[PDB]
Amino acid sequence: SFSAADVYVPDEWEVAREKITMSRELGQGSFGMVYEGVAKGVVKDEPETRVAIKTVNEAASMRERIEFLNEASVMKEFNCHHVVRLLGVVSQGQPTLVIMELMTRGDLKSYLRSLRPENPVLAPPSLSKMIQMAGEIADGMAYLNANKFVHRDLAARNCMVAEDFTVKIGDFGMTRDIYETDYYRKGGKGLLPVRWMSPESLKDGVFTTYSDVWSFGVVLWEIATLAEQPYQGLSNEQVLRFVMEGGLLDKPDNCPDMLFELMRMCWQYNPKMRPSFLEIISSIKEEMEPGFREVSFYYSEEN
Numbered sequence: 001s002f003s004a005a006d007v008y009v010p011d012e013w014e015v016a017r018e019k020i021t022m023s024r025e026l027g028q029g030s031f032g033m034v035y036e037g038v039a040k041g042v043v044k045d046e047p048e049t050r051v052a053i054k055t056v057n058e059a060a061s062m063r064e065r066i067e068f069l070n071e072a073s074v075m076k077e078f079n080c081h082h083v084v085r086l087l088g089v090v091s092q093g094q095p096t097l098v099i100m101e102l103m104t105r106g107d108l109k110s111y112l113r114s115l116r117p118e119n120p121v122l123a124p125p126s127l128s129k130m131i132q133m134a135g136e137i138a139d140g141m142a143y144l145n146a147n148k149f150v151h152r153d154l155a156a157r158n159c160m161v162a163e164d165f166t167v168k169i170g171d172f173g174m175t176r177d178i179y180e181t182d183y184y185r186k187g188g189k190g191l192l193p194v195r196w197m198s199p200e201s202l203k204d205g206v207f208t209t210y211s212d213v214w215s216f217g218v219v220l221w222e223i224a225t226l227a228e229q230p231y232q233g234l235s236n237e238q239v240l241r242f243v244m245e246g247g248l249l250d251k252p253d254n255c256p257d258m259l260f261e262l263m264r265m266c267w268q269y270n271p272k273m274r275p276s277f278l279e280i281i282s283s284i285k286e287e288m289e290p291g292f293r294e295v296s297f298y299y300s301e302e303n
């Protein structure tokens with residue numbers, strides 16, 4: 001029958017329900033369960049594609065379904081190798097489906113934790129692997145900022161790891177369009193976690209590409225800690241005061257000197273003294289693996 005999915009998503013993003021088969025639960029998303037599946041005929045030149053399936057049930061408020069659909073509309077536009085791709089929507093039935101790119105190794109945070117010595121194919125990353133993760137994440141962020149978007153929520157848990165270990169930005173629920181103004185000021189109650197927020201965001205609810213760079217600094221820290229909680233030993237309220245007044249995370253034990261210096265540049269108190277993601281990628285480009293030049297935003301005509 002007739003519902004929000006008939007109205008809020010263009011019919012040319014539509015994909016037939018019978019081209020979709022669901023296989024198992026992947027995890028809880030922000031609107032419903034996420035599943036793994038196979039899509040017959042949704043990717044270019046590929047007969048079948050393994051996919052992630054997001055659902056919203058018939059028994060979900062119209063309000064949340066509209067939010068689900070709007071959130072999909074935003075992602076529609078993002079086509080970058082380091083951003084998880086939206087492949088289409090199944091609107092003509094129930095439950096409503098959004099078909100995503102499958103990232104077989106899940107979210108970066110719990111992937112990093114799985115690397116801790118406490119699977120023959122899982123070992124703590126070398127400096128070289130960490131640089132790769134860094135450039136790939138920075139690339140996807142360069143891409144966003146270039147299309148005049150602020151993520152507002154960069155963190156390991158919001159990145160995903162592919163089968164070949166490629167890392168991509170994977171959650172966009174909090175992104176804001178900053179064409180024209182170059183900042184987003186939060187009016188009222190916000191739900192972003194304090195331990196990933198810039199000093200200026202904490203103080204005035206201001207968000208820019210600079211505050212995204214701050215968060216990037218924090219995910220570097222997560223990579224170097226195999227995903228420990230930032231500012232452990234402080235409560236959320238103590239993090240707010242610590243970070244707002246210029247406090248910084250300590251260099252992780254055994255952390256490559258290079259990585260920590262990069263964090264320090266990201267954690268400049270004055271947002272304007274931070275590097276851009278383009279500058280970050282530029283400083284480590286010769287350490288990226290060969291395939292980067294053919295797939296990144298960095299070496300694209302867009303850039």
Ligand SMILES: O=C1NC(=O)c2ccc(Br)cc2/C1=C/Nc1ccc(CN2CCCC2)cc1
Nearest residue numbers: 026027028029034052100101102103104105106
């Ligand atoms: O692949 C995925 N793509 C998405 O767009 C997505 C969006 C929201 C949510 Br919640 C999940 C996904 C998604 C998830 N992939 C995903 C893949 C595997 C697993 C389970 N394994 C256990 C240890 C290694 C991994 C969990 C999540």
